[PDB]
A = this chain, B = another copy of it.
């Protein structure tokens, strides 16, 4: 029963991916009305099954806790873009299409119905098939959203806000996959860590608002790299310091999900860093921006690796200074993970400091790379904070 649902999802996803990639990367003309028509169709049956599932279940392990919160946060963002889309598109109908208008309406309906369904708590065969088709619907929306940014380059304001379709589809797919598996299942502070973390959070918040929400001057590029190098460098030292603390000091099983999620979600920033490193080593003239870009890219790999080691060891384990110091290390890393969570979440994907990478790969290729890998940093930062909350609670 499980294999039938998996095969249905992949076959549906493959057909959707071919239509999305074929209609955008062809040489005759770029097609979006058919892509919108396909996505509007896929959400319809996905919404219909969920609506049927909700009605048939009203009379009648869970994954990360932060999944529900991130799903609602990005679902609301996906609702705002749809509301702005219909308002602008319904202003004039003689120049546009019906799908240009039915698609945001159906997506808004799909987001509302799916977000409520995933938030709340027998025919297992239909349930698995419906969930897996819903997973394929979200992954098709994720791929179309990624391709949409790649091919790029009052009207309800100016559509300055960008569609958060990549991030919501990631959270929805994870929640649907988790639920699909479960179908038929049988004080103490030195006043030095939190203070430093709060200062870095305040400084980074100013940088994000000043330069990252939206051509920028040289000082702006220096400020952004200076903060990130300091922020990532401090966690690298702090996480390393925490690891050697445990060195001076089994029966519980290995938390496979925690280790897989921490290392798995760190792959997104690894790919961005690896792409950036070769884009600096080659192309990026030897200049201040190249040195800052190379150090920042290298520090992301170091920060992700050494923070993961500290978190994994601390969870598995479960001198008066020993406990007091670990509270600040957990708290400093917790605050430093929150501040750099906003950049992959609410920052312009291509970024302004990525001139070297954009010149090396081109805007179309680099935009696709960041739009694929940066949203996975949202998963890592959210899971690191929750894991550090757990670590800080115990010891």
Name A's B-contacting residues (CB within 8 A): 3, 7, 10-11, 14-15, 18-19, 22-23, 25-28, 31, 254, 256, 259-260, 263-264, 267, 270-271, 274-275, 278-279, 282-283, 359-362, 365
Q: How far is the CA of A271 from the CA of B19 in the complex (A)?
A: 10
Q: Are A7 and B270 in contact (CB under 8 A)?
A: no
List of B residues within 8 angstroms of A360 by Cβ? 26-28
- A263 — nearest CB in chain B belongs to which residue? B7
CB distance from A213 to the nearest CB of B (A): 28
- Complex partner residue of A275 from B7, B22, B271, B283, CB under 8 angstroms: B22
Q: Contacts A3-B259, A7-B263, A259-B3; is A279 near B362 (CB within 8 Å)?
A: no
List of B residues within 8 angstroms of A23 by Cβ? 278
List of B residues within 8 angstroms of A260 by Cβ? 3, 7
- A362 — nearest CB in chain B belongs to which residue? B27
Q: Are B14 and A283 in contact (CB under 8 A)?
A: no
Q: How far is the CA of A225 from the CA of B80 in the complex (A)?
A: 51
Q: Contacts A23-B278, A259-B3; is A271 near B14 (CB within 8 Å)?
A: yes
CB distance from A117 to the nearest CB of B (A): 28
Q: Contacts A22-B361, A360-B27; is A254 near B3 (CB within 8 Å)?
A: yes
Q: How far is the CA of A3 from the CA of B31 in the complex (A)?
A: 42
- Counting chain B CB atoms within 10 Å of each CB, which of A7, A11, A26, A31 scores highest? A26
Q: Are B359 and A18 in contact (CB under 8 A)?
A: no
Q: Are B278 and A11 in contact (CB under 8 A)?
A: no
Q: Are A26 and B259 in contact (CB under 8 A)?
A: no
Q: Are A18 and B361 in contact (CB under 8 A)?
A: no
Q: How far is the CA of A14 from the CA of B263 in the complex (A)?
A: 13
Q: How far is the CA of A283 from the CA of B275 in the complex (A)?
A: 35
Q: Are A275 and B18 in contact (CB under 8 A)?
A: yes
List of B residues within 8 angstroms of A359 by Cβ? 27
Q: How far is the CA of A376 from the CA of B263 in the complex (A)?
A: 30
Q: Are A28 and B283 in contact (CB under 8 A)?
A: yes
6 cross-chain pairs, A with B, having the tightest CB-CB distances, nearest first = A18-B274, A28-B283, A22-B278, A7-B263, A27-B362, A26-B360
